Amino acid sequence: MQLIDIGVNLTNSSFHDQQAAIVERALEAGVTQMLLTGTSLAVSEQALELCQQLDASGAHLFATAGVHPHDAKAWDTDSERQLRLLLSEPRVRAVGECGLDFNRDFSPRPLQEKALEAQLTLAAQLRLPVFLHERDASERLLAILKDYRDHLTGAVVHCFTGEREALFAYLDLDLHIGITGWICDERRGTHLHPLVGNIPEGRLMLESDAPYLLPRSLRPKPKSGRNEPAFLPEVLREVALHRGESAEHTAAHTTATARDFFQLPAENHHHWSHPQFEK
C-alpha cells in the first residue's frame, strides 16, 4: 500500500531540522514519494536543497517552486527570472504552490492576481503542471484559469475544502483535486463526505500539508500537534470509506494519478527516527 503525499511543507521551522526522521517515518509507513511544497522563492530553494540533502538518488523527494498568494506581495522584477531557472531543475516537478487566498488577504488582491498570472504563464511555457491554493476565491480563480487552462498540461486544486458547486466547476475545467486531513475534521470537513466520491479516479490525489491539518481522528496524537507525512494513511482511510472503495484501491489509483501528474519514476525500522513524546 504505497501512497504519495503531494504536498509536504517539510522546510517548516516547526520541524526543527528533524526532516530526516520525518522522511524515515513516512517511508516506513509506505508513503514512498513526497512533493515538498515551495511557497516563496526562498522556501522553494530550501525545498529543493532538502531533496538533494536527504535523497541523492531522486527516488523519493521532489519539489515544487512558486510563490504562495500570502506571499504574492514579495513578487518582484527578478521573480520571473529566478523562478524560471528553479523550475528547470529536474527535481522540481510543478509550479506552485500558487493561487488566491481572499480569506486571509495577507497580500493585496491585485498583487495576488498578478503573481498567479505570471506563474500560470511560466507553467504554460515550460509545460509543467500547476499546484493551486484557493480560499474564498473560487469565482476569481475560475475566471483567471479560463484563459490559461487550454495551455496547461494540468493543474490540481490542492487541499480542496469548498462546496459542491465549486467542486463541479473545477472538475468541469478538467482540474485534479487534492484531499487532506481536513476530511477527518468533524467540525468543518463533514461536507466533503458526500463530495469525495464525485472526483473521478485519475483526478484524485492525497496530501498531508504537514505540519498543518493533523487528522483529528488520529491516535496516538503527537503532543506537538504537528502533522507529518507518515499520518497520511489516516487520510486514506477516511477518503476510501466515503468513496466506498477499499483502502488498497484508493491508495493504488491516487498513487498512479500522482505519478502521472508529477512525472515520477516507478517503484524501486530505526529507533533514532521514532523519538517518543517529541517537542
* Residue positions forming the annotated binding site for Zn(2+): 97, 133, 158
- Between 107 and 136, how does the x/- string for binding to Zn ion read (CB under 5 A)? --------------------------x---
Pairing label, strands 31-36, 204-206: unpaired
List beta partners, residue 178: 205
Pick between residue 213 and residue 240 the one whose CB is nearest to Zn ion.
Answer: 213
Q: Is the C-alpha dihedral spanning 210, 243, 202, 255 positive or negative?
A: positive
Cell output for 33 = 514519494
- The yes or no reply on residue 207 touching Zn ion (CB under 5 A) is no
CB of 100 to Zn ion, least distance (A): 10
Residue number with the smallest Cβ distance to Zn ion: 133
Dist CA 117 CA 114 (whole Å): 5
**Cβ-contact 217, 184 below 8 angstroms:** yes
CB of 20 to Zn ion, least distance (A): 25
- The yes or no reply on residue 156 touching Zn ion (CB under 5 A) is no
Size of the site for Zn ion (CB under 5 A): 1
- The yes or no reply on residue 37 touching Zn ion (CB under 5 A) is no
Collapse the DSSP code of 2 into the 3-class scheme (helix H, G, I; strand E, B; otherwise coil) and give the result. coil
Query: H-helix or E-strand containing 62?
Result: strand 61-65
CB of 209 to Zn ion, least distance (A): 7
Rg for the chain, CA atoms, rounded? 18
CB of 175 to Zn ion, least distance (A): 14
- The yes or no reply on residue 213 touching Zn ion (CB under 5 A) is no
Binding stretches for Zn ion (CB under 5 A): 133
